[PDB]
Design an enzyme around this catalytic site. Sequence first.
Site, PDB file in Angstrom:
ATOM      1  N   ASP A 130      -2.979  -7.005 -14.387  1.00 23.04           N
ATOM      2  CA  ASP A 130      -3.976  -6.107 -13.820  1.00 23.04           C
ATOM      3  C   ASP A 130      -3.304  -4.917 -13.147  1.00 23.04           C
ATOM      4  O   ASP A 130      -3.706  -4.478 -12.063  1.00 23.04           O
ATOM      5  CB  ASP A 130      -4.916  -6.847 -12.865  1.00 23.04           C
ATOM      6  CG  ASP A 130      -6.203  -6.100 -12.598  1.00 23.04           C
ATOM      7  OD1 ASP A 130      -6.530  -5.146 -13.333  1.00 23.04           O
ATOM      8  OD2 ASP A 130      -6.877  -6.480 -11.620  1.00 23.04           O
ATOM      9  N   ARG A 134      -5.452   1.103  -8.637  1.00 24.78           N
ATOM     10  CA  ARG A 134      -6.241   0.426  -7.620  1.00 24.78           C
ATOM     11  C   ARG A 134      -5.537  -0.798  -7.058  1.00 24.78           C
ATOM     12  O   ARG A 134      -5.903  -1.252  -5.969  1.00 24.78           O
ATOM     13  CB  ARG A 134      -7.610   0.028  -8.180  1.00 24.78           C
ATOM     14  CG  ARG A 134      -7.548  -1.047  -9.260  1.00 24.78           C
ATOM     15  CD  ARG A 134      -8.924  -1.327  -9.862  1.00 24.78           C
ATOM     16  NE  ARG A 134      -8.755  -2.150 -11.058  1.00 24.78           N
ATOM     17  CZ  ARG A 134      -8.471  -1.678 -12.264  1.00 24.78           C
ATOM     18  NH1 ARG A 134      -8.387  -0.370 -12.476  1.00 24.78           N
ATOM     19  NH2 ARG A 134      -8.290  -2.526 -13.273  1.00 24.78           N
ATOM     20  N   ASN A 135      -4.538  -1.326  -7.758  1.00 24.66           N
ATOM     21  CA  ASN A 135      -3.768  -2.477  -7.293  1.00 24.66           C
ATOM     22  C   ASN A 135      -2.379  -2.113  -6.781  1.00 24.66           C
ATOM     23  O   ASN A 135      -1.511  -2.995  -6.664  1.00 24.66           O
ATOM     24  CB  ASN A 135      -3.706  -3.556  -8.375  1.00 24.66           C
ATOM     25  CG  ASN A 135      -5.043  -4.193  -8.592  1.00 24.66           C
ATOM     26  OD1 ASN A 135      -5.795  -4.388  -7.632  1.00 24.66           O
ATOM     27  ND2 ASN A 135      -5.385  -4.478  -9.842  1.00 24.66           N
ATOM     28  N   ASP A 148      -1.853  -7.564  -5.542  1.00 22.89           N
ATOM     29  CA  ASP A 148      -2.829  -8.319  -6.330  1.00 22.89           C
ATOM     30  C   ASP A 148      -2.172  -9.369  -7.222  1.00 22.89           C
ATOM     31  O   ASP A 148      -2.016  -9.157  -8.428  1.00 22.89           O
ATOM     32  CB  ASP A 148      -3.740  -7.376  -7.115  1.00 22.89           C
ATOM     33  CG  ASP A 148      -4.967  -8.077  -7.671  1.00 22.89           C
ATOM     34  OD1 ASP A 148      -5.239  -9.233  -7.269  1.00 22.89           O
ATOM     35  OD2 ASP A 148      -5.664  -7.457  -8.497  1.00 22.89           O
TER      36      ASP A 148
HETATM   37  C1  LIG Z   1      -3.550  -9.291   3.374  1.00 24.93           C
HETATM   38  C2  LIG Z   1      -3.181  -9.508   2.049  1.00 24.93           C
HETATM   39  C3  LIG Z   1      -3.392 -10.771   1.497  1.00 24.93           C
HETATM   40  C4  LIG Z   1      -3.034 -11.022   0.178  1.00 24.93           C
HETATM   41  C5  LIG Z   1      -2.458 -10.015  -0.592  1.00 24.93           C
HETATM   42  C6  LIG Z   1      -2.238  -8.747  -0.056  1.00 24.93           C
HETATM   43 CL1  LIG Z   1      -1.528  -7.532  -1.061  1.00 24.93          CL
HETATM   44  C7  LIG Z   1      -2.607  -8.492   1.271  1.00 24.93           C
HETATM   45  N1  LIG Z   1      -2.386  -7.262   1.829  1.00 24.93           N
HETATM   46  C8  LIG Z   1      -3.307  -6.285   1.645  1.00 24.93           C
HETATM   47  O1  LIG Z   1      -4.328  -6.482   0.991  1.00 24.93           O
HETATM   48  C9  LIG Z   1      -3.120  -5.058   2.207  1.00 24.93           C
HETATM   49  C10 LIG Z   1      -2.047  -4.511   2.843  1.00 24.93           C
HETATM   50  N2  LIG Z   1      -2.232  -3.238   3.292  1.00 24.93           N
HETATM   51  C11 LIG Z   1      -3.455  -2.740   3.032  1.00 24.93           C
HETATM   52  N3  LIG Z   1      -3.798  -1.494   3.419  1.00 24.93           N
HETATM   53  C12 LIG Z   1      -4.992  -0.897   3.226  1.00 24.93           C
HETATM   54  C13 LIG Z   1      -5.399   0.058   4.152  1.00 24.93           C
HETATM   55  C14 LIG Z   1      -6.613   0.726   4.002  1.00 24.93           C
HETATM   56  C15 LIG Z   1      -7.439   0.456   2.913  1.00 24.93           C
HETATM   57  C16 LIG Z   1      -7.028  -0.484   1.975  1.00 24.93           C
HETATM   58  C17 LIG Z   1      -7.784  -0.826   0.860  1.00 24.93           C
HETATM   59  O2  LIG Z   1      -7.313  -1.586   0.017  1.00 24.93           O
HETATM   60  N4  LIG Z   1      -9.023  -0.325   0.764  1.00 24.93           N
HETATM   61  C18 LIG Z   1      -9.853  -0.717  -0.390  1.00 24.93           C
HETATM   62  C19 LIG Z   1     -11.031  -1.567   0.097  1.00 24.93           C
HETATM   63  C20 LIG Z   1     -11.902  -1.872  -1.099  1.00 24.93           C
HETATM   64  C21 LIG Z   1     -12.603  -0.593  -1.550  1.00 24.93           C
HETATM   65  O3  LIG Z   1     -12.697  -0.602  -2.984  1.00 24.93           O
HETATM   66  C22 LIG Z   1     -11.850   0.656  -1.046  1.00 24.93           C
HETATM   67  C23 LIG Z   1     -10.342   0.484  -1.220  1.00 24.93           C
HETATM   68  C24 LIG Z   1      -5.816  -1.144   2.135  1.00 24.93           C
HETATM   69  S1  LIG Z   1      -4.352  -3.928   2.207  1.00 24.93           S
END
Ligand SMILES: Cc1cccc(Cl)c1NC(=O)c1cnc(Nc2cccc(C(=O)N[C@H]3CC[C@H](O)CC3)c2)s1
Length: 284
Positions: A130, A134-135, A148
């Site tokens: 994927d 977006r990922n 992801d």
């Molecule tokens: C916490 C965690 C657990 C499992 C895997 C992972 Cl890779 C993670 N870590 C994360 O998801 C993240 C680490 N840093 C992040 N920063 C961040 C800051 C601000 C916005 C976003 C973000 O993904 N926003 C998305 C929210 C969904 C909408 O489609 C808009 C886009 C991410 S997300």
Amino acid sequence: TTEIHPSCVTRQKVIGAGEFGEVYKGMLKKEVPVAIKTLKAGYTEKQRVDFLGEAGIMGQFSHHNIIRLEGVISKYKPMMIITEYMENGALDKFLREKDGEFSVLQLVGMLRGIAAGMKYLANMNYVHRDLAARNILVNSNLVCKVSDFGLSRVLEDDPEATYGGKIPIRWTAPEAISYRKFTSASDVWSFGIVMWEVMTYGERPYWELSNHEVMKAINDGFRLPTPMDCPSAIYQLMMQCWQQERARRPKFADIVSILDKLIRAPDSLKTLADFDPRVSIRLP
Ligand SMILES: Cc1cccc(Cl)c1NC(=O)c1cnc(Nc2cccc(C(=O)N[C@H]3CC[C@H](O)CC3)c2)s1
């Protein structure tokens, strides 16, 4: 995997939300900013295996361009996965909100980082399935990191993946669509699409073509046209990623090498591929 005590975690702001949990920006105990993903009580065995399985996979990796795992909360409820916090969020939305704000060298440097992360994953025998802007997540140093991870959860959770099985058609190599053959070489195809996303500041691949129309065009030999202001070397590389025959595509090692060489001799990026205008403006 580091087990973090729930007292150590302060959730502050919701940055993502699904039916069975949310993603938060928070602090971890000076305190450091983290991202925190939760799994609400009532989860099934499969949800638990998928959720902790993402952390299990991420804990096996240690690379600058791969999201770093801080730890998990699995003893207490709700369960949580805690990672580094990427201040600029997802790469697709980031570029769409920063249209035209970066140099070509900055954009190519993003692609080099993504490619290095993917080379590491492929060498570790991890097929992403994927790969898409977006990922990818972006930090305050402009570093792009692949995110992801998991097994069935990756394509199941992505809304861009539609019913092969459930796949994100516009990013997916023909053999993965046709016969479910996902390999590091299908990830290379996806990387070519990511290159196009980056160089267009987050344009939607194939624009308004339907999924069936995208597959028909690809099978008939059509490919995405060059972005505006795109170095010729970069367009040539993305076109090599989109070869129908999987064995003809570059490996990630080749991609990293080429991008490294272009960045080290940045004048190479000044030669642009011709852009095919969709509008004619004539003035006497
Ligand atoms: C916490 C965690 C657990 C499992 C895997 C992972 Cl890779 C993670 N870590 C994360 O998801 C993240 C680490 N840093 C992040 N920063 C961040 C800051 C601000 C916005 C976003 C973000 O993904 N926003 C998305 C929210 C969904 C909408 O489609 C808009 C886009 C991410 S997300």
